[PDB]
């Protein structure tokens, strides 16, 4: 008996195989590299998670986002927003985030 109703989290692959692709390291530009390496990036190749990590440092440390709404990043007059293809951006739009970064990498 087990009254502890817990999900059996394990590598159980009967019908499906986990949808997991090798996290593609993205290709940067000098502009990205300057922001990355200036916020503590040791890498020259980095995955999407690492973009979130390092690119987020840049937005934070420069305080390019709004004062009242953290989910609203202006970064206007900077290269960041520009390069994303935007005047400002919302971190709520995941798809936009991917594409704004993807705009700057080669695949």
């Amino acid at each position: 008996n087990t009254n502890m109703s817990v999900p059996t989290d394990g590598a159980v692959t009967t019908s499906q195989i986990p949808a997991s692709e090798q996290e593609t390291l993205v290709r940067p530009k000098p502009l990205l590299l300057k922001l990355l390496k200036s916020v503590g990036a040791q890498k020259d190749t980095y995955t999407m998670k690492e973009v979130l990590f390092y690119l987020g440092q840049y937005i934070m440390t420069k305080r390019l986002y709004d004062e009242k709404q953290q989910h609203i990043v202006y970064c206007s007059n900077d290269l960041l927003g520009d390069l994303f293809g935007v005047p400002s951006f919302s971190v709520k739009e995941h798809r936009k985030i991917y594409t704004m970064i993807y705009r700057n990498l080669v695949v």
Binding site: M48, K49, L52, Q69, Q70, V91
Partner: peptide, 16 residues
């Protein structure tokens, strides 16, 4: 969603 910190929602927006 309230006022979720830029620190988290940005760094946690990746698929998996």
């Amino acid at each position: 969603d309230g006022g979720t910190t830029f620190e988290h929602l940005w760094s946690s927006l990746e698929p998996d």
